[PDB]
């Protein structure tokens, strides 16, 4: 069946089944208000909606922006109809080092075919950057390589239109930093500075366009572990001369640091955080008798402590990784070797599946995963 | 946290696990919505292969990655299994584009729509290079069968594409070698229609029975015709078009119950071959190919049969013969062919032709083959 809408003065032809093959959209769901003639009616960007509509309409093509600003307003009005482009994630994997070479390369792992295949680069070769996702746009920031200790770019990939831009400067370069993302905007945390290790604590927001100073951390960290979920964020471990076990908690609301009373049971830098439901979970790394780890730590909420659970099944400090829908994916790392290999943890088992291994073996990269 | 009871194996996991894929028969399941049977343990109940579902499991709590069966066996089990819960390995159809002839070469080589780089990407060639073949989908196979190349003018071999475990192999042999014959799928099984054998242009056609493992002959078309057009649905047949020495516009619907080719009342009033034919609800429709006055067309014909009458729609942006095209859910796809030049520009139906990505080796003769696992 055949229905007519009229979006911003703007009337499409379309049939029931284009406009609701997405389940829970905006624009399935929908006393509705109508126009004169008794036409659905939309107050929105009728040509944003045209080329939303062109997709429907054939989802193997995916538009293609014809600019920044294009590309931006797009996304934006996907997501406020409810619609994705694609029906998988994309997973990235970004940077780092081989060994001998400081990497701008980026690997994609192609669903279709089973392994990663070679994507595009970014401008600046860096290893141990900060990195974050806002509105499935990637960013990275701060690193070093070859030529500095520390740096401030911060580069952002804009998958659309299959392009990197250069975005707003860090006020303190710096590496080992840890970057995540919390209601809106992006955080990035402690590190490096180039001669010392720093508590300073950087906000980048989409409005501004700028990154800003916020409240610092108590206690100073590098290769610190980061996660953001309920409105709070968890920053985990890292060094300041010692492996540490304390965790600091922000809440964003309030602009202030407090110490999180339950420490890790193995103190740890180089690792990895994540969350899924309630609780958080810490992986790898390495410990204050300089042993590279494969151990895991579970925080239950329920019982107020922390917990191992089985561990990787390899070792690895300075690896990629990022948490999916159903999954939390691991890449890369070093542990006496340069590795390439990848494997993904289920909250359903706490057990760990073999992945298929990184083009690049690498360390001190990034991953990161968009939605579009 | 649900326990679950398939085969009498219990497996432990979460109703998010389980009902990620909306309206999958599993999910109807899980959610209250369909007949549930339970064990005295309390725990749902499901009469089914247990190593199946085990590996159907691991896939659910992570779909990134596809499993990869052991042998063409499980291969096929795995699918029938899956094809049960309701369930797909891939959110997004697989489209292969498959042989033909690049202007100076025939060929075995495949090529991949990828829809995350939005661009086609080669994959695994078959192995005997080939243009104008019958191919078909059958339970989420590729099939190719019959077709020529330099060294031969007509085959029966027969080639069946696993992509779960990416391998082609040999099935069985055409009892007629054809090239230019026209391949269909119709109540489980392929359909091998017309051509020419190497000598004469033909009327035969052969059905593919997966249980037997044999091309048996059936009821051949009453007119003998290479490069026809066919599709089939409401549980028949139609083959349209062709050639004998002129092009045809006589269509034959073939009612399996009786075993009998019937002539189709509504001819085309323009003749033609070389052209595709392909059916969305209740209509027909045919496009392209090159009519008697030897022009090669972009002409689309549908047939609606409430108002008894063919009539043209919105032509193909380009005139082209001998091309690769199938129906995905909502579209048409139609990839490469000839019009003087050899293409390799690709258009999608709905009732406008948004243009596709480009092939990477230009191509005609060759088909165009969709699995949705």
Not at 54 to 75: M, W
Not at 210 to 225: D, F, G, K, Y
Not at 275 to 300: A, R
Not at 310 to 329: H, Q, R, W
């Amino acid at each position: 069946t055949m229905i007519d809408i009229n979006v911003g003065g703007a009337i499409f032809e379309t049939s029931r089944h284009t406009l609701t093959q997405q389940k829970d959209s905006f624009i399935e769901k929908l006393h509705v208000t109508r126009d004169k003639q008794g036409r659905i009616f939309l107050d929105r960007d009728s040509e944003l909606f045209r080329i939303i509509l062109n997709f429907l309409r054939n989802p193997l093509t995916i538009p293609i922006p014809k600019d920044l600003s294009e590309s931006e307003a797009l996304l934006k009005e996907a997501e406020f109809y409810g619609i994705k482009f694609l029906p998988f994630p994309l997973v990235f994997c970004i940077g780092g080092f081989d060994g001998v070479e400081y990497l701008n390369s980026m690997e994609l792992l192609d669903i279709s075919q089973q392994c990663w295949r070679m994507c595009t680069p970014m401008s600046t070769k860096k290893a141990y950057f900060g990195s974050a996702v806002l509105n499935n746009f990637l960013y990275v920031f701060g690193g070093n390589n070859y030529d500095y200790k520390a740096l401030f770019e911060t580069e952002v990939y804009d998958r659309l239109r299959d392009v990197w831009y250069v975005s707003s400067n860090l006020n303190i370069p710096r590496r080992n930093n840890c970057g995540v993302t919390s209601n809106g905007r992006i955080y990035c945390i402690g590190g490096y500075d180039g001669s010392s290790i720093i508590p300073n604590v950087e906000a980048y927001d989409h409005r501004m366009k700028a990154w800003v100073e916020v409240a610092p951390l108590n206690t100073p960290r590098s290769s610190a572990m980061c996660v953001a979920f309920d409105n709070k964020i968890y920053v985990i471990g890292g060094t300041n001369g010692e492996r540490l076990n304390s965790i600091e908690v922000y809440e964003e609301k309030m602009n202030k640091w407090e110490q999180f009373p339950y420490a890790l049971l193995e103190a740890r830098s180089s690792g990895a955080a994540f969350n899924y439901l309630n609780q958080i979970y810490v992986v790898g790394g390495i410990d204050n008798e300089h042993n590279i780890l494969d151990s895991v730590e579970q925080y239950q909420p329920f019982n107020k402590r922390w917990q191992f659970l089985n561990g990787v099944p390899e070792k690895k400090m300075n690896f990629g990784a990022a948490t999916l829908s159903d999954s939390y994916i691991i890449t890369g790392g070093e542990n006496g070797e340069v590795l390439n290999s990848c494997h993904f943890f289920s909250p359903d088992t706490n057990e760990w599946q073999l992945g298929p291994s990184l083009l690049v073996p690498r360390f001190g990269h990034s991953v990161l995963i968009a939605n579009i």
